[PDB]
Task: inverse folding
């Protein structure tokens, strides 16, 4: 499937995933497209931050579904 | 329907020369006259412009204080994260208060 990851800058970065994709691995695909280290990204869905150990399915995120990407808002 | 030129309206008109003329006689221009030669010239602007380099006071009747900051290049010590210059307002309205507060941290951390 694919999901839409709207960045803070209003850019939809669509990526391909499974419902079983973990958030760590999603952040790694964001790094592949945006060049931000996964340790330095934050991810929101429906007004809550996600955590690395979870999956799209944990949050009931399905196909053609929208997320937020922010940088961690930490220097490193 | 004409009129003669003035000869008395101000001291420069009474002397029939602007102070700029006697200053140009005293020193023709800056040292750049030694360069940008090309056998001929349409105008001296490709050269010392028979003068000295202008400043904004010669273009707008105001003054400006001495600078207290530098901008040698626009892409060094930059935000290097999505901040005020580029965070989208619809996405920011959707984005939860948790990161709105953390993002105000990122705006305070600007340079």
Result:
């Amino acid at each position: 499937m694919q999901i839409f990851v709207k960045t803070l800058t209003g850019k939809t970065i669509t990526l391909e995933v499974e419902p079983s994709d973990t958030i760590e691995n999603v952040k790694a695909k964001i790094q592949d497209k945006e060049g931000i280290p996964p340790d330095q990204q934050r991810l929101i869905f429906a007004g809550k931050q996600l955590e690395d150990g979870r999956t799209l399915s944990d949050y009931n995120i399905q196909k053609e579904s929208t997320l937020h990407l922010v940088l961690r808002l930490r220097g490193g | 329907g004409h009129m003669p030129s003035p000869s008395q309206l101000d001291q420069s008109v009474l002397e029939a020369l602007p102070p700029d003329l006697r200053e140009q006689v005293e020193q023709v221009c800056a040292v750049q006259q030694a360069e940008s030669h090309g056998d001929k010239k349409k105008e001296p602007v490709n050269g010392c412009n028979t003068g000295i380099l202008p400043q904004p006071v010669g273009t707008v009747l105001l003054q400006i204080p001495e600078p207290q900051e530098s901008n040698s290049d626009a892409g060094i010590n930059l935000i290097a994260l999505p901040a005020f210059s580029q965070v989208d307002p619809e996405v920011f309205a959707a984005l939860p208060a948790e990161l709105q507060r953390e993002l105000k941290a990122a705006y305070d951390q600007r340079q």
Observations:
- Helices of chain A lie at 23-34.
- Residues 1-76 of chain A form one domain.
- The first strand of chain A starts at residue 2 and ends at 7.
- The longest helix of chain A spans residues 23-34.
